[PDB]
Amino acid sequence: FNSIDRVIFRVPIRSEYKVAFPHLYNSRPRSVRIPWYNNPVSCIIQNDEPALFFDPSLNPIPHFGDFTLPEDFAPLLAEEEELILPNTKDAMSLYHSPFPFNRTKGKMVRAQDVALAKKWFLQHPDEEYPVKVKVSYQKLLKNYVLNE
Amino acid sequence: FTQLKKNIPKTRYNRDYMLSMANIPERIINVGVIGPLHSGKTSLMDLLVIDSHKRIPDMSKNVELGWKPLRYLDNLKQEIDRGLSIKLNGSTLLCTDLESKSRMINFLDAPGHVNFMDETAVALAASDLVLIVIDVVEGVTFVVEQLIKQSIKNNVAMCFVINKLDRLILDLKLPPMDAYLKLNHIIANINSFTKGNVFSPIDNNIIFASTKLGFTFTIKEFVSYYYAHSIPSSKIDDFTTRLWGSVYYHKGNFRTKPFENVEKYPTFVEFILIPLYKIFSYALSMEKDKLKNLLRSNFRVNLSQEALQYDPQPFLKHVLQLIFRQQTGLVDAITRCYQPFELFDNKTAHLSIPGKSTPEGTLWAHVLKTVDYGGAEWSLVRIYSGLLKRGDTVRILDTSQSESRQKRQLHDISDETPSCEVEEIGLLGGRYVYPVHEAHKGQIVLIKGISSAYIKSATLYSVKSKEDMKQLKFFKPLDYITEAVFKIVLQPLLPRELPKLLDALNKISKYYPGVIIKVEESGEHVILGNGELYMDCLLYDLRASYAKIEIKISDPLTVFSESCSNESFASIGLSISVAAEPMDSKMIQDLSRNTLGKGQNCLDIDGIMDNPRKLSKILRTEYGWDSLASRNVWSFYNGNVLINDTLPDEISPELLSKYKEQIIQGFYWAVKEGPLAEEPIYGVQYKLLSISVPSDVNIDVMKSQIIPLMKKACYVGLLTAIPILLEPIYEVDITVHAPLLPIVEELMKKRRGSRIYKTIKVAGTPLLEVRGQVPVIESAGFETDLRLSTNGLGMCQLYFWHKIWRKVPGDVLDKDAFIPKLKPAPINSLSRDFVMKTRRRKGIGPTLEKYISAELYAQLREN
Ligand SMILES: Nc1nc2c(ncn2[C@@H]2O[C@H](COP(=O)(O)OP(=O)(O)OP(=O)(O)O)[C@@H](O)[C@H]2O)c(=O)[nH]1
Numbered sequence A: 001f002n003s004i005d006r007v008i009f010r011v012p013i014r015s016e017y018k019v020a021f022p023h024l025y026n027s028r029p030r031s032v033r034i035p036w037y038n039n040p041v042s043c044i045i046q047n048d049e050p051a052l053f054f055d056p057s058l059n060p061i062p063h064f065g066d067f068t069l070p071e072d073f074a075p076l077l078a079e080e081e082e083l084i085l086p087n088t089k090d091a092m093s094l095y096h097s098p099f100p101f102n103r104t105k106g107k108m109v110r111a112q113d114v115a116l117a118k119k120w121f122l123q124h125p126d127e128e129y130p131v132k133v134k135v136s137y138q139k140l141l142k143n144y145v146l147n148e
Numbered sequence B: 001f002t003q004l005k006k007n008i009p010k011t012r013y014n015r016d017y018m019l020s021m022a023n024i025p026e027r028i029i030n031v032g033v034i035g036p037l038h039s040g041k042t043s044l045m046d047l048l049v050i051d052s053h054k055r056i057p058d059m060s061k062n063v064e065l066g067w068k069p070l071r072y073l074d075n076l077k078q079e080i081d082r083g084l085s086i087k088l089n090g091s092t093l094l095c096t097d098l099e100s101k102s103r104m105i106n107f108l109d110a111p112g113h114v115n116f117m118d119e120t121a122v123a124l125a126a127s128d129l130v131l132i133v134i135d136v137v138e139g140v141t142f143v144v145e146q147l148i149k150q151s152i153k154n155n156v157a158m159c160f161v162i163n164k165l166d167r168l169i170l171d172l173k174l175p176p177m178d179a180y181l182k183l184n185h186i187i188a189n190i191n192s193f194t195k196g197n198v199f200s201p202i203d204n205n206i207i208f209a210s211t212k213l214g215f216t217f218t219i220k221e222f223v224s225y226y227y228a229h230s231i232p233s234s235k236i237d238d239f240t241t242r243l244w245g246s247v248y249y250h251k252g253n254f255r256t257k258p259f260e261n262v263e264k265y266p267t268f269v270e271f272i273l274i275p276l277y278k279i280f281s282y283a284l285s286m287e288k289d290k291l292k293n294l295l296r297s298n299f300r301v302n303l304s305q306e307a308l309q310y311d312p313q314p315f316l317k318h319v320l321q322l323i324f325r326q327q328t329g330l331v332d333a334i335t336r337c338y339q340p341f342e343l344f345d346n347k348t349a350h351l352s353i354p355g356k357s358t359p360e361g362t363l364w365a366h367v368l369k370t371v372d373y374g375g376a377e378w379s380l381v382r383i384y385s386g387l388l389k390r391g392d393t394v395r396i397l398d399t400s401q402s403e404s405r406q407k408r409q410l411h412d413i414s415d416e417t418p419s420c421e422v423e424e425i426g427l428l429g430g431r432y433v434y435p436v437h438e439a440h441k442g443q444i445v446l447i448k449g450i451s452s453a454y455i456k457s458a459t460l461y462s463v464k465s466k467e468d469m470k471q472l473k474f475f476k477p478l479d480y481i482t483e484a485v486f487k488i489v490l491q492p493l494l495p496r497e498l499p500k501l502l503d504a505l506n507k508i509s510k511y512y513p514g515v516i517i518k519v520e521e522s523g524e525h526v527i528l529g530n531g532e533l534y535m536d537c538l539l540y541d542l543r544a545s546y547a548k549i550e551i552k553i554s555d556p557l558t559v560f561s562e563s564c565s566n567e568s569f570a571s572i573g574l575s576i577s578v579a580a581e582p583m584d585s586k587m588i589q590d591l592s593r594n595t596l597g598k599g600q601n602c603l604d605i606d607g608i609m610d611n612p613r614k615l616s617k618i619l620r621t622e623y624g625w626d627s628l629a630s631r632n633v634w635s636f637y638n639g640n641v642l643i644n645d646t647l648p649d650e651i652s653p654e655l656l657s658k659y660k661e662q663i664i665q666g667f668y669w670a671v672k673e674g675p676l677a678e679e680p681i682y683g684v685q686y687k688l689l690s691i692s693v694p695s696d697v698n699i700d701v702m703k704s705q706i707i708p709l710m711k712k713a714c715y716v717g718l719l720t721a722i723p724i725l726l727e728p729i730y731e732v733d734i735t736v737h738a739p740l741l742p743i744v745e746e747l748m749k750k751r752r753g754s755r756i757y758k759t760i761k762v763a764g765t766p767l768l769e770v771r772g773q774v775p776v777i778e779s780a781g782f783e784t785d786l787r788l789s790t791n792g793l794g795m796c797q798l799y800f801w802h803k804i805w806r807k808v809p810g811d812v813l814d815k816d817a818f819i820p821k822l823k824p825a826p827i828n829s830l831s832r833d834f835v836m837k838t839r840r841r842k843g844i845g846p847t848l849e850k851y852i853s854a855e856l857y858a859q860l861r862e863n
C-alpha cells in the first residue's frame, strides 16, 4: 500500500470537494451523481428608484456632410417614442423570477402581480432571489469571519 | 443501403447538394468555434443545427419554447450532467451568405473550460477560420486574450462573435448609450491584441449575438433586412459603414460631432441598439394588440395566434427569431473574412515543414484526434491532397515518428513500415454521423480503420508513385496549449485486474490528448492532466466505462523540475568535467515561449540549429553572450542549453566533433531525469569544461561510454552548485463581484505562495477581474472553496500555458529537516519533503558522494 512515507500532505480535502469532484477526491461509491460544474457569475441589477440608468455599483466605461439620405428616413422604431413603458421594470423583475412567477399565458404583467411575488420570496429567505444583491454581501461578508 | 441512417433528421437543403460543394476545394471552409467557459458556442451551434434541419426527434419539450437549450453538440452523459462541452464535437452544414453563394462549412465546437485546452488546440490545428465567442459581461478576459494570441500564433483567420447581448438589456439594465460604450470598449481591447488586423462591425469582422434568445446578427445583415429597401441601391454600402463610430444622423445628414439640439446618439445606438432595446422592452411589456401591429409595420413580421399565448421568455425568443432570420450575417462574416491564399500555405508549413505543394495524385491528410463514437474508435481527419476512397488502404504514421522520419527522408535524398485500411467515412452532425463514400481535399471527416497505428495524432497518406514519396511532408505533433501538471498516481484494487487497467489507460491516452500517462520503472502508473476537472472526468471514463473496476488513487500531486541556483565548482578509465549554473531569467521565459530573442530578430526553436549564423548573432546581440560562447552552443532541450567551453589546445576540435553527437545524447539523458528525485531539469546552463581523449581503443565502444559518463558528469555539475527543486505555478483568473474582494484575499492567504497580481475593473459591471498565481500542489479544492465562500458570486479557473516554475522553499540537501508524519510539512522542509517523497515512489538521501570517488570527495571536503 502507498504508505505515509509516500504521500505528500499539503491541504485537507474538505467534504465539499467530494460532492464537487466525486471520482477524483476518493468518493469511492459508484452511485454518486456528477454535478453541474457551475454557472457564469450572474450580475442581475434590480435597481430600485423612468428610463434605464447606469447603476453606481458598476465600474465606469473608459471613453465618454458629403453623403446624404432622404429627409424622412428614420430608424426602425422611431415612431414609438418611449423605450420604456410604465410596466417594463416589473416585467423585467418578473423575467428573472423562478418557475411559478415568471410565466404568464400571454397576459400583461401588472404591478400587483409582482407585488405578491416580491412579498412571497421575501417571506421565505431560503431560495429564489432575496439573498441576491446587498443581502448576499451582508450574509457572506459576516459568515466568513464567523466560520474562521 | 440505409442501415441505421433512417433515424437522422432530414436537412431543409438536399445533403447531396452539400456534398457536391466539396468537388470544388475553394467551396469548403473549416471553421472552429472557440472561447471561454460558458460563453455560448455550444448554444451557438444549436441555432445553425436548428436552422439547417427540418425537425428534431425526441424534442418538443421546453427546448421548443426555449426554456432549456438543446445541447445538440454536448451529448456525452458526463457532458449533460456537468453542463459544459467536454470533448470536441462538430457539424458539417451547408450555409449561404448574404450574396446567395453557398458553401459547405465544417463547424467544430470546442470546449471552453481551461482544462480542455488540448481540445481547442485540435480545433486550431483543423480550422481555417475561428469564431471566438465571448461573454459581453466579462469582456476580453485572460482566456480569450490567450485565444486571440493563440489563433494569431497559428495561421487561422478570425471573426469575433460577441455573445450574451441580453445580459446588458436585462441583467445590467444599461441604457443604450452606455451599452454601446461597453461594446466599443470590448472591440477596443480586441484590436490591442490582433496586431495589424483591425476588427470592427463595419468590416464584417464582428458578429453580435444572444444565443439564448436565438439570434446572431451583423450590421450588414441588419441593413439588408429593414433598411436596404428604404434607400437607393448604390448608397447601401456607404450607409452601413456610417453605422459605427462617432457618426450622428439627423433629418438626412451625417456629421462627426453631435447635432446641437437633438439627442447626441451615434448612428449605431440610433439605428441598431435602441431598436433592439425597444423590441426587448415592448415584447416583455407591451400589449399584444399594439405590438403585433408594430412588428407588421416595421419588420414585416406576422405573429401567429398561438404566439400571443407564449410565456414571456419563449415569446421573446420567438419574435427575435422572426426578426433576425437564420444567422445569415454570421455566415457572411465567415466567407468574407478569410482570403485563403495567404493563410493556407502558411498554415500547412507550421503544421508540418515548409516545402512545395504535394502532388495532386498523392493522398495526404491530417488525422488530428482519436474519438470513440458508438463504442468504436474514430479519427478526426482533414484532407490536404488526393481523394479518399472508402477501402483505400492508407499508410498512417504516428506524429511522434514524424521528426525521425523527416530527417531520414532528407538523408535518403543526399517500403513504409505501417499501413492499414480505411473502413468507414462519416460527416459530423453533432448528435449523428452521416455516412459518406468519399472525402475530398479540404474535407474534415470521421475515419474508423486508422485508429490502431497511432496514439495521439498521425499523418495519413497514400504512396501513389514511387518518386512522389520523396516529396511528402509529415505533420508535426500538435502543440496542446497547456502542459500537464496535475499528477495523480493510481493502482487497481485487485492486482490481478491490472491488465484491464492497462488497456483502459491506453484508451484514455488516445481519447484525452492533453493527458500524459506513464508508468515509472519502480511500479505504479501516473496520470498527468491540467486541472481537477480534467482528472475527475477521465477517472469516470476510466472507472465507469473503459475498465469497470474498483480503482485506488492518491491525493493531488505534481511533476517537479530540478535545477541549480549557483555556478558550482569545477570538479571532474576516463572522466569528463562540466559545471552548471542557472540560465538567464529573460532567456528562460523566451524558451518557454518557443522563441529565442525578441523584436523581429528571433529564430523559431525548431530550426535553431539549422541557422547557425543568425543563432550566433542573436545570442551575442540580444542576450549579451561573449564572442566565443555564442558560436560554441551545441544543443537546446526543455529550457536548458549545453555550451562548449573546452579549450582548443587540450582536446582537438576535430576529435571533439566525432564525439559531439554522443555528448549531446548524454546531455539529453541527464536533463530528462535529474539527480535529486529523477525529475526533468529546467533552466540550467551546462558548460562543457573538458573531456579526456584516451587513444588505443575502438571508437564505437568509446562512443558508447561518453553518453553514460556525460550523463553522470552533468549530475555532479548540478549537485556541486546549490541544487533546488522547482514546482509549477498555476495562474488563476478570478471574476468576482467588487465588494466581495475580501473573501478572495483571505482565501488567497490560506493557500501558501499565492498572491494577487493585476486587478482590473470590468467596465460596466459590478464584478472585478483579478489575475493571480497559485502553486499547483496547494491548488486542490481552491476553485470549490471560492465558489462556496462566495455563493457563486465568485469564480476562478486555473491554467498552465505560461510555464511558471518557482523554487520550492527551503534547502533540499538539508537532511535535518523536521517533516511531521501526520500534518503538512513546515515551509523550510518543503524541498526536502517533496524530493524524498517523490523519490520514494520512484525508489530509494541524494548526495554528491555516490558520483565522486571517496578520495576526491574527501579532498574537496577539506578544501
Ligand atoms: N444570457 C445568455 N445566456 C446564455 C447565452 N448562451 C448560453 N447561455 C447560458 O450559458 C450557458 C452556456 O451554454 P453553452 O453554449 O453550452 O456554453 P459553452 O461555451 O459551450 O460551454 P463550454 O464549451 O464548456 O465553455 C448555457 O447553459 C446558458 O444557460 C446567451 O446568449 N445569453
Ligand SMILES: [Mg+2]
Pocket (backbone or CB within 6 Å): B042, B074, B083, B084, B085, B086, B111, B112
Ligand atoms: Mg459545452
